Design a protein around this nucleic acid. Structure first.
Ligand SMILES: [Cl-]
Ligand SMILES: [Cl-]
Ligand SMILES: [Cl-]
Ligand SMILES: [Mg+2]
Ligand SMILES: [Mg+2]
Ligand SMILES: [Mg+2]
Ligand SMILES: [Mg+2]
Ligand SMILES: [Mg+2]
Ligand SMILES: [Mg+2]
Ligand SMILES: [Mg+2]
Ligand SMILES: [Mg+2]
Ligand SMILES: [Mg+2]
Ligand SMILES: [Mg+2]
Ligand SMILES: [Mg+2]
Ligand SMILES: [Mg+2]
Ligand SMILES: [Mg+2]
Ligand SMILES: [Mg+2]
Ligand SMILES: [Mg+2]
Ligand code: NA
Ligand code: NA
Ligand code: NA
Ligand code: NA
Ligand code: NA
Ligand code: NA
Ligand code: NA
Ligand code: NA
Ligand code: NA
Ligand code: NA
Ligand code: NA
Ligand code: NA
Ligand code: NA
Ligand code: NA
Ligand code: NA
Ligand code: NA
Ligand code: NA
Ligand code: NA
Ligand code: NA
Ligand code: NA
Ligand code: NA
Lengths: 246, 119, 145, 115
RNA sequence: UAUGCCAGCUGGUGGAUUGCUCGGCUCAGGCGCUGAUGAAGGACGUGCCAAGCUGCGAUAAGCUGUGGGGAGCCGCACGGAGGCGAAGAACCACAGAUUUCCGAAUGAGAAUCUCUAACAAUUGCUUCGCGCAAUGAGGAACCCCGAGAACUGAAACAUCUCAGUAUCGGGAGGAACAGAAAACGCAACGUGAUGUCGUUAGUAACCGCGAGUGAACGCGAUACAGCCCAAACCGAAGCCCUCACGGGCAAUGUGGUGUCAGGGCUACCUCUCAUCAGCCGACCGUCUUCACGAAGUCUCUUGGAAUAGAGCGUGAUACAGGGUGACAACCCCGUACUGAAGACCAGUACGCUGUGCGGUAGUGCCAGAGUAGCGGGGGUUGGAUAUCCCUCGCGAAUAACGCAGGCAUCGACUGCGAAGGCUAAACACAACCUGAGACCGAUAGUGAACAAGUAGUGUGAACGAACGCUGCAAAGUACCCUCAGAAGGGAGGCGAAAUAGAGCAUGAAAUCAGUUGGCGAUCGAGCGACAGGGCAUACAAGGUCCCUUGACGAAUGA
RNA sequence: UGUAUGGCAAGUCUAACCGGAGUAUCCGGGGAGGCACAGGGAAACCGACAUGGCCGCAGGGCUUGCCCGAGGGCCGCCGU
């Protein structure tokens, strides 16, 4: 198919062929698998102290004093799992493999599929993104890679009727639960992904909910945050080109 | 760091000289324009206007600045004890704005004016 | 919902009498214990059998059936075409760490083939010649005698 | 519980055909795809060549693989083909997706099931 | 209707629950030795008032200098009194001063004190004098060398296994150890020091051939690096102390040469860019610290308070995280960007100086002995005839020789030179610094968020808890009455709230006081389920229900 | 050792590790090696049906009981 290229003003400026990958049948099950793996693979090993609750010579008096056969020291029960201060029977363990494998072919296929889900206005709208447009992904001239001010990228996006999505992501959520105590107090919607060719858009990255990536390594999470396909994206003339051989 | 426990910790255990940044208040529009800074370390001489508490709207002279507790005493911003004595109601520089600076110290004025250092 | 997830409340978690899941006695001994007594069933019989020749005196032949060669003669467009002619050595994978390449005679041969290998089976020749072909034996293959 | 959304649709389409049109193979193929993947068909060319006949569509209730040779000019319809299979077939005949077969022949006529 | 049963209400007791996190747990990166110049640890001191902790040491919460920092300060610790700071204090970084007693503890003795100059003891050098030096002890584990179980598994048990594990003795370093082939043996016209990682492989091998045990060569990677003696031939040409003088060492050999690309010697060819010694000496990177650093504190409403709702506006190479009287990019610290410093990399790389590599022919000049190897007895290993080691006995050759290639002997072939020595880098741990988290969230998580190895127990080795939360601000309750009264009570005052009033957020159950409804001093015990009656009931979140008659009307049926 | 789902298929998967980067994620590279592609025999050593026949389910065809009949079942035949 064909994709309309836009200049830094929001006016059409030609158009190239939308590479074949964007015709890869959307495969949410595969995309979800790839994202679940990426998320699990960055999780850190953890586990309680191997010796917690065991640092004691507590013994059971056995029968005779009308007490349960529970190990005790200085009159207090210890060590056993049913005892306060006792060991944790089956605790989290460092040794556990918290990683997930994924065949390269299966992962690459999901990348292509997530890419394809990008060129579908309906999917993108379903995923939740707010925008007034028909053609998608939003393709732009390589001069985008030279912008420097975030404000500039704003105007361009407003000129593309795609800034509404950033308005959507301009609201952090204060999560329910103790994540808060571990530094995970806030969370916010995912907005526009900006794929360029040379380097990530320093100018757009701070946009609320935005994520910046490069065609050579843009991944499944990038294209389908949370495993949900159809992210409102904006490629770069050259970006669109590179992506094709992924 | 990014972890809340460490953030609050470093702020509560910061050595005395680092406590200075904890008693900084925003500068009035004129003062901002005049010295090229958005805020300054409130001093016992400066004049300030209360922008937030139950005393919002009132102005007065900074009578005391405690680095330990990171709080300031502003003239007439008080509380009436039971016996009748009028004691000061501590304020966080964050809810305050500097409208006039005490510049008797050569050093403060110098820093306050250099474009490469902030006071 | 998995089986494990439905055990809370069952008390015995599927082990039957709570007097069951205790120690190794419930398994008739640790590991293969009693493989010659109470649990002899399904264990291979005890005893020694045969001998082994030292590892470095053993030869490993790289083999391939005519069927594989023949089925891909056309596809092997990167190999000699005569009045075809192929050097098995270049076809068989794992032909480096192999002591020698041998052609086996499984399947049919629907082409005139001139095969060169270190060794052939009776049926490999019979089939290759019967299809109007020849079998060339490598210099290495010159160990037949 | 199939996971592939595409396989799900295919199966629903194979049914709709078996019910609407007269196709009985379609409902037959649907019932096999619904069964465990391990029971699905994995057929190599050598087997198609042996039992297929021209003007009779070969229907594989599974996937076609590339081992062996195919000379007959037949239209093979499967859930999927290995890249090699699809290539060798189109050289002497035609490789087609069940989704297409269901459309060109909803009555499922003149077809031979091969596994 | 007493004693009393059940449920509730008001108040309590209790401290669950919810919310909160100054602590833990785990992972990751960096970094890493201290001590006779007396460490680490401990004792006792030290403050205006000082019990604990921390700091410090008779100069005692400190003294000096330089740099930073800044108008405040006098640790935790918010009192009273007083003091210090523009003579630039506090505070931070580096450097220096001081630094009691015991402690390896070293003049001698001793439960931290005492008695009459002291490296005690063992060593090396030696002016043979403690004159110059060394050792000792500590450290989270890691590392190396020795000693070395048992429960257990084998459904008993002895070999085997647990296991060369636990534990013990000795000792090094920031890493250890290993290491330039008497190798390998995909047997080759091949590989080429050593660790380590992935694999080879649960393969080969062991084994009451039971249970079990269990490599290597090679390969793919990481990192790479290669050298010095002994002897031959020279023969004092040498080395150490000292400013010097002078002394000491050294023919039982200091020093030159040389080290399998064998060397030496004799005769030549050519040349050095090898090697070895020494000088100089980083970039980048990484880790930590620091400077600078954009934009609202505008309107209305609510509120005790606006980081809320509604409205208007702004920055963003910065929408990480935290603070602030409630949900904050723009109020404060930070954060992006840029820049600086220190540490590690590293006295390494690069560069340089000096030396001089190599080749031909001749020469039986040299080339590490209780060794190689054999036997007896054991241990150990996968090592089987074929692992590695100990012990007792025996015991060779000399490169024209010797060892190895998984049984022995002889020959061939291939590899390689033992019985002297050194060696960067890649790897282990986690004391220390910093970072991180689908970890826990105060009976959890460390034993320890608190006085935590604290209180406390034991003669001792050793053992060992519990205790987090007022409020936005102390505004931490003046005055009056009562009382034996700084008690408590009453009244009163503060605050949005005192049922937030001091172990003070919330405040469950068990349970207690008072009290409401029902029952109740002639009556029977799994305490109820289902039916049906009495009596009792503010609202809300349920709104149905009763009787006449009529319609419909299964089985059944006068 | 099964099973369900999913990728690829006569193949399939990388391990350590290397480069990139948005720097534990992630993108690219890495096939060493493993399993599968032939078995039988202690070993030496030797080395197989891309289908020859018959039943016949599903499914298809036909002029509506008659054909073709994958899979499956019964034999043949082949390697050791
Ligand atoms: Cl064998
Ligand atoms: Cl097949
Ligand atoms: Cl080799
Ligand atoms: Mg515990
Ligand atoms: Mg919760
Ligand atoms: Mg300034
Ligand atoms: Mg002494
Ligand atoms: Mg036993
Ligand atoms: Mg080691
Ligand atoms: Mg036995
Ligand atoms: Mg063992
Ligand atoms: Mg070996
Ligand atoms: Mg020398
Ligand atoms: Mg043993
Ligand atoms: Mg605890
Ligand atoms: Mg005792
Ligand atoms: Mg309370
Ligand atoms: Mg290979
Ligand atoms: Na303990
Ligand atoms: Na009891
Ligand atoms: Na793990
Ligand atoms: Na069971
Ligand atoms: Na049980
Ligand atoms: Na057993
Ligand atoms: Na038996
Ligand atoms: Na090889
Ligand atoms: Na360190
Ligand atoms: Na004290
Ligand atoms: Na000191
Ligand atoms: Na000494
Ligand atoms: Na002496
Ligand atoms: Na037993
Ligand atoms: Na026994
Ligand atoms: Na044994
Ligand atoms: Na504020
Ligand atoms: Na011996
Ligand atoms: Na050898
Ligand atoms: Na607690
Ligand atoms: Na391979």
């Amino acid at each position: 198919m064909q994709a309309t290229i836009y200049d830094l003003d929001g006016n059409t400026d030609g158009e190239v062929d939308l590479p074949d990958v964007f015709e890869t049948p959307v495969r949410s099950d595969l995309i979800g698998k790839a994202v679940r793996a990426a998320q699990a693979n960055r999780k850190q090993d953890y586990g309680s102290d191997e010796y917690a609750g065991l640092r004691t010579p507590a013994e059971s008096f056995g029968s005779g004093r009308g007490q349960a056969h529970v190990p005790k020291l200085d009159g207090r029960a210890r060590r056993v799992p049913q005892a306060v201060k006792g060991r944790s029977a089956h605790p989290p363990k460092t040794e556990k493999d918290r990683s997930l494998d994924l065949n390269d072919k299966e992962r690459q296929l999901a990348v292509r599929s997530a890419l394809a889900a990008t060129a579908d206005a309906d999917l993108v709208a379903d995923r939740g993104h707010e925008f007034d447009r028909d053609e998608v992904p939003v393709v732009v001239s390589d001069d985008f890679e030279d912008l420097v001010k975030t404000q500039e990228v704003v105007s361009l996006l407003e000129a593309l009727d795609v800034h509404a999505d950033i308005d959507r992501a301009d609201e952090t959520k204060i999560k329910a639960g103790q994540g808060s105590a571990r530094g995970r107090k806030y969370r916010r919607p995912a907005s526009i992904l900006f794929v360029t060719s040379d380097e990530p858009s320093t100018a757009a990255r701070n946009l609320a909910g935005a994520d910046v990536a490069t065609a050579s390594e843009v991944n499944t999470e990038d294209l389908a945050p949370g495993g949900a396909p159809g992210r409102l994206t904006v490629f770069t003339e050259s970006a669109l080109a590179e992506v094709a051989e992924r | 760091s990014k972890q809340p426990d460490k953030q609050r910790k470093s702020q509560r255990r910061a050595p005395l000289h680092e406590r200075h940044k904890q008693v900084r208040a925003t500068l009035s529009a004129d003062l901002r324009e005049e010295y090229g800074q958005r805020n300054v370390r409130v001093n016992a001489g400066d004049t300030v206007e209360v922008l937030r508490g139950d005393f919002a709207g009132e102005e007065g002279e900074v009578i005391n600045v405690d680095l330990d507790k990171a709080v300031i005493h502003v003239e007439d911003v008080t509380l009436e004890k039971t016996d009748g004595e009028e004691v000061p109601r501590p304020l966080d520089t964050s809810n305050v704005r500097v409208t006039d600076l005490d510049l008797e110290d050569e050093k403060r004025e110098a820093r306050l004016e250099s474009e490469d250092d902030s006071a | 919902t998995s089986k494990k997830k439905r055990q809370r409340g069952s008390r015995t978690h599927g082990g039957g009498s709570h007097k069951n899941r205790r120690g190794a006695g419930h398994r008739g001994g640790r590991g293969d214990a009693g493989r010659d007594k109470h649990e002899f069933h399904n264990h291979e019989p005890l005893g020694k059998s045969g001998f082994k020749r030292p590892q470095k005196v053993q030869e490993e032949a790289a083999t391939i059936d005519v069927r594989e060669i023949d089925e891909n003669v056309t596809l092997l467009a990167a190999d000699d075409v005569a009045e075809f002619r192929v050097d098995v050595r270049d076809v068989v994978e794992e032909a480096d760490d192999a002591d020698y390449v041998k052609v086996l005679g499984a399947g049919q041969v629907r082409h005139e083939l001139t095969l060169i290998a270190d060794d052939f089976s009776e049926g490999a020749r019979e089939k290759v010649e019967g299809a109007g072909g020849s079998v060339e034996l490598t210099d290495l293959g010159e160990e037949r005698q | 519980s199939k996971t592939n959304p595409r396989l799900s649709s295919l199966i629903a389409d194979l049914k709709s055909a078996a019910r609407s049109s007269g196709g009985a193979v379609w409902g037959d193929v649907a019932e096999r795809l619904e069964k465990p993947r391990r029971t699905h068909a994995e057929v190599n060319l050598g087997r198609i060549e042996r039992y297929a006949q021209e003007d009779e569509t070969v229907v594989v209730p599974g996937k076609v693989l590339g081992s062996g040779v195919l000379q007959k000019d037949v239209t093979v319809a499967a859930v999927d083909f290995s890249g090699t299979a699809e290539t060798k077939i189109d050289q002497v005949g035609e490789a087609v997706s069940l989704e297409q077969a269901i459309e060109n022949n909803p009555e499922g006529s003149h077809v031979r099931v091969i596994r």
